[PDB]
RNA sequence: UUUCGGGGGUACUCGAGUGGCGAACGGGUGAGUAACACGUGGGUGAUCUGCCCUGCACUUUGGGAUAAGCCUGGGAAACUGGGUCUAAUACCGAAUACACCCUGCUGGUCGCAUGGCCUGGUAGGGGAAAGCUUUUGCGGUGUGGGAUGGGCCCGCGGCCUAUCAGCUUGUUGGUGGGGUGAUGGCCUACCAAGGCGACGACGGGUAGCCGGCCUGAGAGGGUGACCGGCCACACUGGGACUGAGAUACGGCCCAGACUCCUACGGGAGGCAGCAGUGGGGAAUAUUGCACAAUGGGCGCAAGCCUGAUGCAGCGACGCCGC
């Protein structure tokens, strides 16, 4: 509030927060849809939902929104859940 | 600071002469003041303190400096007495006086403090300067013709120069072979009393 | 980045430095990974000592010298050895040793007689 | 003239995890035993040798260790709260 | 170019603006904290690491905006809405990568059990990038390895008090999920009933810890000023965001106390940074000089910034010398 760089950083941090929030919400929605599909119990829709969600996960990891380890953990969990079904 | 008042006072109080050729001390060898004749009580502390006062008033060194010297001497791996005596004897003014260039230690100190000497080719005016092995003490050329050094260089028949020093040049150079040992110091008093006093 | 800095020592008027290896984020007088030399500019030829092997290792892993340390590395030839451009030539102007006290003592004694 | 496309990592020798020998004093939890360890140091002031006791919690999958058995343990990463030891084998049963 | 009111170009240069990096270092204080906070030694087959160094492979292709500018509205102010318009190393889609990530099968090997390694083999799916500059030219992306900086867990060690004897219910353990960089009741559902304690749990009081410092023959006792390391905090109490990294001192959001502006609608602030002021007190300093040296940030560089720092001023406050 007192130093110019602080004010510029206020604006830039706000815009970065907006972008990260969008990406995280999209990832959460994709994972939730896959979980619902698995709960229904069909394989094929679960299969390419898993494919789309895994692609979304690592491509959001590349953007720096989430750590690559987090994307790996999520992908492992989803694939294991599908395999169990 | 420095002690400035009368000199024979200390000699009379301490019962020995410290200057060396003082007639007033011979005339009255008893302590000064009204009660200089009153008999005194005997105590070890009194004797030790009087020995320390003798030592530190012969060389003109104040109490704090003397205590620093004692700590230094005790720290050294010799024995405390002769170590302290050699530390005292290595002072620049004492070297100048013992070399016969000053009649009294006070004027040796006065000459040193006024920058009349030059040790190892660099001007030194610090009476407490300690002198190591193989030091050359010279009088700077400007003061060679002065009255004090004139009369110092034409009465070289006084007290003998100790072994560890040597006046070598017609210009009265001083060469230091090694720091004196207890045998060659030739000083009054007893160092053991001082060691006892400072161990109290 | 790990850097080769100069930390200050000595008293007020006389700065004497140690050539240390430390992270760029630490303070000037902070903890040092390694001490690989010393530098005394108050002396007339300004004594410089650099441990060549440790300097080579730290330059190899990628430590970045500061400008004074870079100048010293060029002087001692360690920088050129690390790069290899002209060769590693010692431009170091070492202090001239002083005659011994015994030499001058005997010279005075001989001059007397 | 071209450098390798893969640089193998410099091998690091494995560390030595701490080991202990103790006695089982509790086996009331699943897959977990409580082991008592004894240590004999010297008193820092009086110099006498003092025997001191300590309880650790170890992990054994099948739970073959009863109460009173001399067992062997090796340290490990935290398996739970307060669980930091792994049962190697039962030194002697009792 | 000119009527001297100024007008155009340039890009040397540069206010404001977008964008990058920095701002998490450096500087202060010792309130809290009896704790894995600190000291010392280990473990991480349970982990991250921007900039830096060094191998390898790339650096393809397309698009939609917007700040600034211009026009206009609201408000006392703080500040804020709408229209139009414009650029990028800003933002976004795709291709490629098969070094990387996930899953299935499978070989060998080392163990310290989960497991680790051989970039093992194999089948399927997938994951990027940015240009600028003619000059000692600087950059972008993935990936192998170093270096640095961490995170987490553990042994042992350093206060006083039973005129403080019981304490604990996510509390002790398991399973499946979730979460995290990572292990873990860290979180959660279910299951079992454990766990700690006179070798002093649970309470109460006090306290930043250490290298060190003072004293002492030594053992020991007292202490933690300067200097150096770690920790905690930044008006009080919570919270996340951005980021490689956050107790975010000179960031944000909320609540509270206090101080200030207001057209009563609403707004602003945080010296335990450097000087300085008031108060408290027996008692503790200048609203100084400079980036010349060292360290740091940005920049290709010249360079800019730095109350860090280097110096100076005041006080016999101390040591030393005259």
* Full 3-state SS string of chain D: CCCCCCCCCCCCCCCCCCEEEEEEEEEEECCEEEEEEEEEEECCCCCCEEEEEEEEEEECCCCCCCCCCEEEEEEEEEEECCEEEEEEEEEECC
Cβ neighbours, 10 Å, residue B17: 19
HSE-up of C82 (CA within 13 Å, CB side)?
22
Contacts of C107 (CB under 8 A, 6+ apart): none
Taking Cα atoms as reference points, which of A74, A20, A18, A69 lies closest to residue A50? A74
Cβ neighbours, 10 Å, residue B1: 4
Cβ neighbours, 10 Å, residue A54: 18
The DSSP string of B43-94 is -HHHHHHHHHHHHHHHTT--HHHHHHHHHHHHHSSS-HHHHHHHHHHTBHHH
Domain B92-185 adopts which CATH fold?
3.10.290
What is the Cα–Cα distance from B76 to B70, expressed in whole angstroms? Answer: 10
- Which residues on chain B are in Cβ contact (under 8 Å) with C104? 134, 136
Structure tokens at C91: 């431009």
Q: Go through B150-172 and write b for each residue having 16 or more CB atoms within 10 A of its CB, e for each that does not.
A: eebbeeeeeeeeeebbbbbeeeb
- Bridge partners, residue C35, by sequence: C20
Structure tokens at C109: 């004694």
Q: Sign of dihedral through CA atoms A9, A12, A14, A16? A: negative
Work out if C81's Cβ lies within 7 angstroms of strand E.
no
A53 with A34: CB under 8 angstroms? yes
Domain B1-91+186-200 adopts which CATH fold?
Ribosomal Protein S4 Delta 41; Chain A, domain 1 (1.10.1050)
Contacts of B124 (CB under 8 A, 6+ apart): B92, B112, B115, B117, B118
Taking Cα atoms as reference points, which of B164, B159, B160, B161 lies closest to residue B180? B164
Q: To the nearest 10°, the Cα dihedral for A9, A13, A14, A18?
A: 160
What is the Cα–Cα distance from D23 to D54, expressed in whole angstroms? Answer: 11
Nucleotide nearest to B1 (CA to C1'): E322
- Bridge partners, residue C7, by sequence: C18
B165-167: strand order across its sheet = B122-123, B117-119, B136-139, B174-176, B165-167
Q: Strand B136-139 and strand B117-119: pairing?
A: antiparallel
| Residue B137 CB-density burial (10 A; 0-12 exposed, 13-18 middle, 19+ buried) | buried
Query: Which residues 22-61 of D interface with strand E at a CB distance below 7 A?
Result: 26, 28-32, 34, 39, 41, 44-45, 51-55, 57, 59
The phi and psi torsions of D87 (rounded to 5 degrees) equal -75, 125
**C112/B168 touch (CB, cutoff 8 Å), yes or no:** yes
Q: Which residues form the domain of D54?
A: 2-94
Angle between helices B191-198 and B80-89 (to 10 degrees): 110
* CATH code of residue A18: 1.20.58.110
Delimit the domains of chain C by residue range. 1-95
Taking Cα atoms as reference points, which of D82, D92, D90 lies closest to residue D54? D82
Cβ neighbours, 10 Å, residue B69: 22
Delimit the domains of chain B by residue range. 1-91+186-200, 92-185
**Interatomic separation, CA of residue A77 and C1' of nucleotide E195, rounded (Å):** 33
Q: How many residues does chain C have?
A: 113
**C108/B135 touch (CB, cutoff 8 Å), yes or no:** no
Q: What is the 8-class DSSP label of residue B130?
A: B
Coil, strand or helix at C19: strand
For B78, B97, B170, B199, the CA distances from B88, given in Å and listed in that order, are 15, 13, 28, 19
Taking Cα atoms as reference points, which of C39, C57, C84, C83 lies closest to residue C2? C57
Contacts of B127 (CB under 8 A, 6+ apart): B60, B91, B92, B93, B108, B109, B112, B113
D67 with D25: CB under 8 angstroms? yes
B82 with B182: CB under 8 angstroms? yes
Structure tokens at A11: 């604006």
Coil, strand or helix at B174: strand
Nucleotide nearest to D25 (CA to C1'): E195
Question: What ranges make up the beta strands (E) of chain B?
Answer: 117-119, 122-123, 136-139, 165-167, 174-176
For A8, A65, D70, the CA distances from A13, given in Å and listed in that order, are 9, 13, 60
Structure tokens at D43: 């008193």
**Interatomic separation, CA of residue D63 and C1' of nucleotide E101, rounded (Å):** 38
Structure tokens at B64: 């704090």
* CATH code of residue D74: 2.40.50.140
To one decimal, the resolution in angstroms is: 2.9
Element (H, E) at B184: helix B182-185
Work out if D81's Cβ lies within 7 angstroms of strand E.
yes
Contacts of B27 (CB under 8 A, 6+ apart): none
D31 with D43: CB under 8 angstroms? no
Element (H, E) at C39: strand C34-39
B92 with B129: CB under 8 angstroms? yes
Q: What is the 8-class DSSP label of residue C29?
A: T
Angle between helices B63-75 and B191-198 (to 10 degrees): 100
What is the Cα–Cα distance from C52 to C36, expressed in whole angstroms? Answer: 8
Q: Strand D49-59 and strand D32-42: pairing?
A: antiparallel
Work out if D93's Cβ lies within 7 angstroms of strand E.
no
What is the Cα–Cα distance from D39 to D50, expressed in whole angstroms? Answer: 8
The phi and psi torsions of C90 (rounded to 5 degrees) equal -85, 100
- Which residues on chain B are in Cβ contact (under 8 Å) with C108? 136, 168, 173, 175
Taking Cα atoms as reference points, which of D23, D10, D8, D33 lies closest to residue D83? D33
C39 with C76: CB under 8 angstroms? no
Residue C1 contacts B, CB cutoff 8 Å:
no
Taking Cα atoms as reference points, which of B198, B180, B177 lies closest to residue B83? B180
Q: Strand B122-123 and strand B117-119: pairing?
A: antiparallel
What is the Cα–Cα distance from D41 to D54, expressed in whole angstroms? Answer: 13
Cβ neighbours, 10 Å, residue C59: 18
Contact of chains C and B by CB distance (3 or more pairs under 8 angstroms): yes
Residue C112 contacts B, CB cutoff 8 Å:
yes
A72 with A80: CB under 8 angstroms? no
The phi and psi torsions of B85 (rounded to 5 degrees) equal -65, -40
Overall domain count for chain A = 1
Nucleotide nearest to A21 (CA to C1'): E241
C6 with C29: CB under 8 angstroms? no
């Amino acid at each position: 509030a007192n130093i110019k760089s602080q004010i510029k950083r206020i604006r830039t941090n706000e815009r970065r927060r907006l972008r990260n929030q969008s990406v995280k919400s999209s990832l959460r929605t994709a994972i939730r849809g896959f979980r619902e599909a698995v709960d229904a119990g069909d394989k094929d829709k679960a299969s390419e939902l898993l494919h789309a969600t895994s692609r979304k996960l690592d491509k959001a990891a590349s953007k720096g929104v989430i750590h690559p380890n987090q994307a790996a953990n999520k992908k492992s969990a989803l694939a294991l859940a599908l395999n169990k079904l | 600071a420095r002690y400035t008042g009368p000199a024979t006072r200390k000699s009379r109080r301490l019962g020995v002469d410290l200057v060396g050729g003082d007639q007033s001390f011979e005339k009255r060898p008893y302590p000064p003041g009204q009660h200089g004749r009153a008999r005194i009580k005997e105590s070890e502390y009194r004797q030790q303190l009087q020995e320390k006062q003798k030592a530190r008033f012969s060389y003109g060194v104040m109490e704090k400096q003397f205590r620093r010297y004692y700590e230094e001497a005790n720290r050294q791996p010799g024995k405390t007495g002769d170590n302290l005596l050699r530390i005292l004897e290595s002072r620049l003014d004492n070297v100048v006086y013992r070399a016969g260039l000053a009649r009294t230690r006070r004027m040796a100190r006065q000459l040193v403090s006024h920058g009349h000497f030059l040790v190892n080719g660099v001007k030194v005016d610090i009476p407490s300067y300690r002198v190591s092995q193989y030091d050359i003490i010279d009088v700077k050329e400007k003061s060679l013709n002065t009255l004090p050094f004139q009369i110092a260089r034409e009465t070289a028949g006084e007290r003998p120069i100790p072994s560890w020093l040597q006046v070598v040049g017609e210009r009265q150079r001083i060469l230091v072979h090694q720091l004196p040992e207890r045998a060659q110091i030739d000083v009054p008093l007893t160092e053991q009393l001082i060691v006892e006093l400072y161990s109290k | 980045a790990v850097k080769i800095k100069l930390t200050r020592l000595g008293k007020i008027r006389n700065p004497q430095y140690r050539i240390i290896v430390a992270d760029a984020r630490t303070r000037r007088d902070g903890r040092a990974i390694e001490v690989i030399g010393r530098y005394h500019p108050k002396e007339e030829p300004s004594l410089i000592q650099i441990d060549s092997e440790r300097a080579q290792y730290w330059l190899g892993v990628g430590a970045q010298p500061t400008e004074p340390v870079l100048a010293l590395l060029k002087i001692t030839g360690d920088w050129q050895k690390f790069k290899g451009l002209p060769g590693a030539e010692g431009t170091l102007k070492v202090k001239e040793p002083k005659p011994s006290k015994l030499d001058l003592f005997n010279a005075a004694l001989a001059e007397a007689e | 003239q071209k450098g390798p496309k893969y640089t193998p990592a410099a091998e690091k020798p494995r560390g030595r995890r701490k080991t202990a020998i103790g006695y089982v004093v509790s086996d009331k939890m699943q897959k977990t035993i409580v082991v008592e360890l004894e240590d004999r140091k010297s008193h820092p002031l009086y110099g006498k040798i003092i025997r001191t006791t300590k309880k650790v919690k170890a992990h054994d999958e099948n739970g073959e260790a009863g109460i009173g058995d001399r067992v062997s343990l090796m340290e490990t990463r935290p398996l739970s709260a307060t669980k930091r030891w792994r049962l190697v084998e039962i030194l002697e049963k009792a």
